[PDB]
Amino acid sequence: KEQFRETDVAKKISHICFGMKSPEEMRQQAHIQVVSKNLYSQDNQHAPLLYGVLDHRMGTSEKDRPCETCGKNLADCLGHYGYIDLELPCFHVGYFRAVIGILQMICKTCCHIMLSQEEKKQFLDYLKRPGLTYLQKRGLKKKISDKCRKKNICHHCGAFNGTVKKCGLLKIIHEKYKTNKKVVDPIVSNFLQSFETAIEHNKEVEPLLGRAQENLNPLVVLNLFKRIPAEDVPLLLMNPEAGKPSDLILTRLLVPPLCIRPSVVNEDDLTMKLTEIIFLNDVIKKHRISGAKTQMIMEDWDFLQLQCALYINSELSGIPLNMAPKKWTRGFVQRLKGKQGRFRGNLSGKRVDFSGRTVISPDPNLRIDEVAVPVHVAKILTFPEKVNKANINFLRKLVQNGPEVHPGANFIQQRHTQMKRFLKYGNREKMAQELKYGDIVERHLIDGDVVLFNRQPSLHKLSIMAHLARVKPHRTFRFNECVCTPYNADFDGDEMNLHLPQTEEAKAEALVLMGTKANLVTPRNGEPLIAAIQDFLT
Amino acid sequence: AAYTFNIEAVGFSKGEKLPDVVLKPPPLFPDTDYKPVPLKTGEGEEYMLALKQELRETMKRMPYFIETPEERQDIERYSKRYMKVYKEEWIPDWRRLPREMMP
Amino acid sequence: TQAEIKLCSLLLQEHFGEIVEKIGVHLIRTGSQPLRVIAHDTGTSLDQVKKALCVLVQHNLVSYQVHKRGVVEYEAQCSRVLRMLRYPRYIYTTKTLYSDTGELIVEELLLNGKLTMSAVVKKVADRLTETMEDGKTMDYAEVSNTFVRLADTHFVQRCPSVPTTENSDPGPPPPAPTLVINEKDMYLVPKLSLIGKGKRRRSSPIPDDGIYWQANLDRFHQHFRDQAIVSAVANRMDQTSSEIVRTMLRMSEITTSSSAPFTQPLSSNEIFRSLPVGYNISKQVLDQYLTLLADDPLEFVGKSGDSGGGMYVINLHKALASLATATLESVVQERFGSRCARIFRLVLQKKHIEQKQVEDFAMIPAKEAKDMLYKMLSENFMSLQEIPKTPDHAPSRTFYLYTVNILSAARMLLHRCYKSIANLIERRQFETKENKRLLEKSQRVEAIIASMQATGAEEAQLQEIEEMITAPERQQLETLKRNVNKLDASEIQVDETIFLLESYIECTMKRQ
Amino acid sequence: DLMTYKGEVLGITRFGLAKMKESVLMLASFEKTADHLFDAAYFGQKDSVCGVSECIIMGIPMNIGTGLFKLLHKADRDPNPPKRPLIFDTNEFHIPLVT
Amino acid sequence: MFVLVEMVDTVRIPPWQFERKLNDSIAEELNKKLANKVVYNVGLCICLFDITKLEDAYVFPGDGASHTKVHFRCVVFHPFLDEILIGKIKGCSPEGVHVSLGFFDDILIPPESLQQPAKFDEAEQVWVWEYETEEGAHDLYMDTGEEIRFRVVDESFVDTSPTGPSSKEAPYTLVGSISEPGLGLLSWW
Amino acid sequence: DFESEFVEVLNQQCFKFLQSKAETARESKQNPMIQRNSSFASSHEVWKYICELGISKVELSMEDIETILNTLIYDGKVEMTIIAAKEGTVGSVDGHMKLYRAVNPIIPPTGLVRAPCGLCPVFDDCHEGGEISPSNCIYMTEWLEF
Amino acid sequence: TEGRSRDGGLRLGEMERDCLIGYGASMLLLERLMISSDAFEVDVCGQCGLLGYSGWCHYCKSSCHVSSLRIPYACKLLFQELQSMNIIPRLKLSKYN
DNA sequence: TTAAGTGGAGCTGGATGCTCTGT
DNA sequence: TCCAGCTCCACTTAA
RNA sequence: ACAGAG
Ligand code: SF4
Ligand SMILES: [Zn+2]
Ligand SMILES: [Zn+2]
Ligand SMILES: [Zn+2]
């Protein structure tokens, strides 16, 4: 009757292979096409438009309005993508030094790579050895591009190939028609005289015709990169299974889901840049029909090269004065870099719960491995104790005390349910009788819980050790003054942190490895740190 | 509303005649002003068309059309000899072929 | 060359199968590889690699060269697999120029790659029994009489042969025999006194062993290069002007190379005897044509001489540029209108021109010309020059000069044609595959007619064939066949654009 | 020994660390966070999660410390238990039909 | 009429069953997961036949349950092509005859493979078989299911997987035949 | 621009005068060297014909019809040869004179435009399995119908 | 959240992560930074390497390769801030054995 | 005489400590 | 506010 | 954005 299906496919991450998309795998990923520019409808309903940004087919970023692709809330949706078409292509600002890198090696006429036939056999035998590391790859692109830039003629088509270099903000020049004081080459002597009709009406061609070279732009370097042979792609050191050279010039652009850019910041700086990119796809589209000059079309195109650059990195160097931004916005790079980025601010170190912070004060009547937790913090902090055969009589009494008397419990969770009955209400004498095995009682922090303890400038590993908690009626963290040497605490208005581990394995790694009785000596030179101090020596 | 860039560097010196807002996206297949030029006919152009479709049926039958071998047959039966696909096998000139290619 | 590898993925699948195209595409895509890694990087068994390599080394599609340590590497020819599309144009151009025997000689060579002369004269004479009747068999003399006339005109060339191991390196056997071309005996046919009769398929030692013959594809492309030039003159000036062009290129068949900007100069004293005598023309009127064809600024022909009366040359590379221009400007009119092709002819002539001069010189106003300028920079028919005043290269202080480049637009136009044919094959294979229920049902009603056609075939089997439910379904099978016949024919006619484009791209490359 | 195990004295800058460590997220978690990401996109560089700093990002337990070894449970188990004998399809009664 | 199917699987044993021999707890867990279900390409699994190899019982971090990879063999109802079976009828329909085979129920005798002297009913569900001398057009296929003997000619696998995000077709179908002389009801031959 | 509504009719009027004058040279067939010279038209000859036809009230000046015939060159329909003014009825350039003749195109139209792929405005967005695909295209299924 | 006014919660910073490595504490460093901050699961298509939803890869249009994965939410945010930049983080998932 | 490989000089882009507590 | 890479330009050897 | 505290 019913086909077998594997129930829970838990899998482990083996490797991450970075890459890029073709501009028509963006269409296969996204759900809608974004064409409109306005954020909300003009009426008092405050509803988002149907084919612009903040469309809720791409997700949701508030509790009130659900999503439209999956019909699920903010808590459950993984977010969904859209896309934007561009009327003219633009450089991706991240790969711009890689588009120049490909152009310095391939021929600018036949799109083959400027190498001799023997040199291709040398490097493609180097690329067959197993275990090729990422350092060995980045050195090889240096060795290959240095061999291409020593040649000026192609071994396959024979056309001349000059230097390829940057000539301003997001502009690429190719000096095909270089001249010297020597005998003039025949192919450059044709270019300097074929300007005949332009000199007839325009006088200023004559001083400027010597400075005319081939100016590359995303209409042309897109068309060159489609004609690179696939045999000559790994000599550009691009893995052709993760990306192609045609993908470095964007012509279509994914927009992020709405949970990447929440609706109350009102709108995010990424949404406001996506408005200006949609708006410039109508400014260019109108000027191509209403007959603007070539001086205006290029300027509009440049604005679109700038607005897709500031959308990615809003800290460029060579922005012109008439096109510099007035205020500072976040691109994607600024919300990845720095101390307040993702990697340092939200990934390597992040805010945790089941933690406290109080002024400290001394107490020598405790042991060297105990700490005195105030009762106001011991009622808030909870450890989820599972019900089994050894602790059922204890946890029934800790449920019967309830959330207000100290050896008590704040929550209770059924066996195969994910919903926590808040134990302040109901009759706790009934919920204590119904404790089955496998239920979780979230008891308060009691005497004997392994708890971490931390003074904040943490210079060595003994700045955070684990103690055994004891509840006492005042309002400070308290410990024996022999422990004041590793933390470098001094009781002059000092705040230390606390962390209650929430797992049995997190307990046992904290007790065996991180206890005070197992960290008496410093790991630096083997000298004891937990020892006596003033008035215990005197 | 005002943007980050200057509109006056983009254009719009009068301050009016801004482009309209696209409400619905353009269709997948925008209609064409011009049509395909019709094909060339004649007694030469049609015989090549007749010869082309004969080459598909021919080269699919020749033994150079190396089909994929069958597998995962379930049981054996006496009707295998009645279902044996017979076809003559071509053998190359191994003097022209390299030594590493003998079966 | 993503369009080339996509199109070669279809031509290997239709003509050779599926477990050969995985070997065939991988050799085009990556490069020359030894044999052990092709089984690794693709995943087939090592025996199926040897089957797929012996079918690709047969049809002259992959080569092999010995390298260091005696390994053999296989290198595919991407240009050769695309010439499998021009097979019906090859079998027809040997039907116009040669007899129907010679039509079948080229056909057995293109369908087996390499054959001996003794094998092809047997197989053609066997297949010509169907074309004849009434006691007349086909004999091996008149087949070979057509065969040796081909080798005189170089349409069939000898393959590169095996080396003589008794003369060069006797002893240990090499892994690969390292074949080599011999210029002298490419067309020096072996003599065959052995005759016989073609068997009529009744169904009830070799002196040129090793001498394999193959089709010379470079000869046809020299021949097709003529008709592109000859029929161009036939449209411009005159048919008598065209036969003179036809006369000179036929004389230039054996005496020049296939890549020469200027052919051998022929004097007008010997063109006159070379022309067919049906043209009532004098020597002086012959000198009138040669001085008015020299007056053409298209320079199909030139003077290039003074001795021997009227010395004249006919141009080869410059004649292709006049055709590739007409190839490139025929698509600008049909895609963007006649008024847009006025600009594409304007900016081509005046080599660097701006917006204001185009609207003046072509009498097309603003906002209608500028739309026809801007839809061509996005389609890469036309480029800007961008002469700056400052090294800042700011857009508000510079001049944008429009420019049409023939070479960059011809390589672009060729790349569209490869994808254009691959889309036609994909549409045909889509409608063929989705009617696999219709075609097999129409096959089973014909199999009752095909099987038991004469032996015990009663007359009461002709009414149960249309009786099946395929009777209203014949509307779709006729709608099928009118679709397949149009897409196959459009697949052939795009190759006319490829040859006019690829010859111009090939001839402009110095290949140093 | 960490500075001099690649034959050359390497700093503890971002320049010496770019030549020693191979993990991409370890490089991008320290300095020049943008450029390593576009370089790994360009080269198509794949990245294992074997390093310590990207085990912390991806949420899998790290390899040093208590993650170096694997634990087995000592259950009462009999590997390779006595197999059930087939009765019909044994090999001695079913010699094939074809020659 | 069955085949053994050799499979591999990773089985979670929760820690309250560490009192019991692991060879017994695996066999109970694999029968709770594979019984009465049609695996896609191989058919309908009845029960576990035996365990053939039992690898190590790891304990992963974040859990106390022992995971072990199990090699085993499972008995599967999967009749080969052109096999002769015996079974009862479920009923009749204009689409065909529904044949019940004990545990299994989806066996369609198509009207194109019925015995030829009757091919269509008189706007009635119950199918007939017209013999000339005796029982013309009334020899009926009873819905109570007297035993027939049929010959399987076609089997089909439809992939019952979700098409689309989350928030009943028959997966293992079988087409028999009756037109051969000697097939049919056990009374007739 | 002068007028798009005005020069649009001269394109089909001036070409017919270069066609019939080339047609009568084709019907002459006396001497093919002289038949070529019989096809050339004087720039002053073609100008005095169009103003005789009576199209507009405004006078068609010779300096304008000298430039409207260049659009017949740019449409690829006629040629232009400049000869010396050794003898002429006008010889409007000092020492020079122009001559026009109607010609044919070089080739029949290419095979790319006969397929619908060469004319497609969304050619770059078409792939094998996505939304825009040859297996479900409108531009072929229209073209396959007629 | 951040501070005492917002019922914030304290910060295992960059330096306190370095102390827990020195003890060799692996599961405690897992519990602090995954289990008790931002634990989350995603549907991953093991064929194309991209993120899917609800057991449905919209890229491949299938349900035969989707799989669950235990990931911190700030990395799922990273795996969607990188695709908008066109730096695609393609995954390959093996079994957890 | 000049082709070319390598020094020295200027330009460019990157980075600069950990937390809470309030306005 | 300080410091590695990248690129431009004279300066010998060698033919 | 500023001031504090250790
Ligand atoms: S959309 Fe269809 S008709 Fe148009 S180019 Fe693509 S495949 Fe050809
Ligand atoms: Zn959603
Ligand atoms: Zn080149
Ligand atoms: Zn997928």
XYZ file of C-alpha atoms in Angstrom, chain F residues 83-88 90-97:
14
model
C 34.042 60.416 -64.331
C 35.997 63.438 -65.510
C 34.161 66.382 -67.055
C 35.922 66.332 -70.425
C 32.514 66.811 -72.063
C 29.020 67.122 -70.645
C 26.339 70.466 -67.421
C 29.398 69.008 -65.717
C 28.273 70.367 -62.352
C 31.639 69.656 -60.691
C 34.692 71.391 -62.146
C 36.470 68.543 -63.917
C 34.173 65.794 -62.597
C 30.813 64.150 -63.281
